[PDB]
Amino acid sequence: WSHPQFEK
Amino acid sequence: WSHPQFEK
Amino acid sequence: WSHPQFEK
Amino acid sequence: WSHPQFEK
Amino acid sequence: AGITGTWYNQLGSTFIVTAGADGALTGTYVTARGNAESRYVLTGRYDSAPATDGSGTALGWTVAWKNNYRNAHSATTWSGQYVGGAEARINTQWLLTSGTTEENAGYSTLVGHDTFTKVKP
Amino acid sequence: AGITGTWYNQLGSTFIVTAGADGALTGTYVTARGNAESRYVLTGRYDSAPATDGSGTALGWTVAWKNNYRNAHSATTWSGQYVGGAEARINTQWLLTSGTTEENAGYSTLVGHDTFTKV
Amino acid sequence: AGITGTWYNQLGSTFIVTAGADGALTGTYVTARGNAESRYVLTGRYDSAPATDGSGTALGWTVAWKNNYRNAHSATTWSGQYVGGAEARINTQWLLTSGTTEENAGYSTLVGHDTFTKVKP
Amino acid sequence: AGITGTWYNQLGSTFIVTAGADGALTGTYVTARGNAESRYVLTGRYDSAPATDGSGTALGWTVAWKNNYRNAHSATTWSGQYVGGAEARINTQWLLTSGTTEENAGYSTLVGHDTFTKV
């Protein structure tokens, strides 16, 4: 589940 | 989801 | 060579 | 002080 | 105004920083998404009197991944150094710690590296 | 308290921190030497609205190793979490980066871990 | 037979290692679950002629998290040192890398630390 | 090949590796100096049955920095993944631990990253 540091 | 290194 | 983080 | 990993 | 300015990492995230006379780093970290929801406070410290032998300027900062829009219950620290001159760059290693229960602590901390390049004037 | 207060690591260093408005960490880091020369400014951030499921509170901070007495041309960041409950603790991993020339960059960054307690 | 033997970490995992005359580390890593499915091959290297000034003995090893029962598509390296004598101990830092796509590479690598204590004879 | 072959990092070091039976990595690591004194044994492990979804192949290896010519009383582990496809690469993070006395343990472990290519 996604983390803001790595979001596109 | 679990990883063997940390399993109990 | 001596660093403050580790000094005694 | 010189370590082989980083030597030129 | 060496450190102060706008920087970009390899993924398109933005580091908008002010280096204060007292060693303070303050500013905004923007994820590559680039919208309002992508902006977070950063705070840190830097060496305000670096060596003059060609060495870089040591620094670090933290982002807690909470803003007025969302909260990822986590914080990243970047530790690194500023290298001035031709192609100014900030080279970093980072630690992303998420809040976990004790039994999940092995999953708590991601590690990586980021290189930031400055927008020229 | 929760985060705000005086904490000690395994080597006898002191972390004197205030967890303030809207996620700010400010305070003083004192090395184990414990004299005036051993005190450094710290600043960082923390999650001011943590989960309520038993998980810790994420936080990080930085010390640049310059004060009015000395300068080690380096900075450490601690990344970790506050664990409340019966015996409060802050568990961290840290990165100590020293300024280096490009050719000496392999020597630039030390890594370790520190646990802080209120004892 | 300083390094050679059975060690336990803080969570109840087991490190069963042989230190060979040529610098080789070979053996089995057992997770805290402790069943057949919990056993993995390890291989690594150590300094077979350490300093004699009280310093520890540098070493490292790798486990790829595949055995005949399961595969977590990942590998952990432990880097550390053996400290002999009273309460012999191996103090480590570790990196767990999972296979990821390129866009998920920020999630690839966990970091932590483990201290192992030896079973006395 | 996939993993087996000769690789180079960003500093000109050489990683000469064989990915063998059932997950074994063996070979020689050569520092950028490139002489006899610069060659060290490596051993490690890799995932011999990776996912088929585009993800990389996890691997790690260790060099203890002793050979017949010199000894730096230290060991480095590289933890990473092989990425195949158009331009093959091995992306790693590494930990270099030097033997230290207990009081010098804060200086024991350096951290960094290396990318290996077949160029």
UniProtKB/Swiss-Prot annotation, chains E, G:
Cellular compartments annotated: Secreted
Keyword Lipoprotein: no
Extent of motif Cell attachment site: 45-47
Cystine crosslinks: none
Predominant localisation class: secreted
GO cellular component: extracellular region
Organism for this UniProt entry: Streptomyces avidinii
Keyword terms: Biotin, Secreted, Signal
Function in brief: The biological function of streptavidin is not known. Forms a strong non-covalent specific complex with biotin (one molecule of biotin per subunit of streptavidin).
Protein name: Streptavidin
Family from the record: Belongs to the avidin/streptavidin family.
GO MF, one example: biotin binding
Residues bound to biotin: 29, 40, 78, 94, 106
Superkingdom assignment: Bacteria
Occurrences of domain Avidin-like (ranges): 1-121
Subunit structure: Homotetramer.
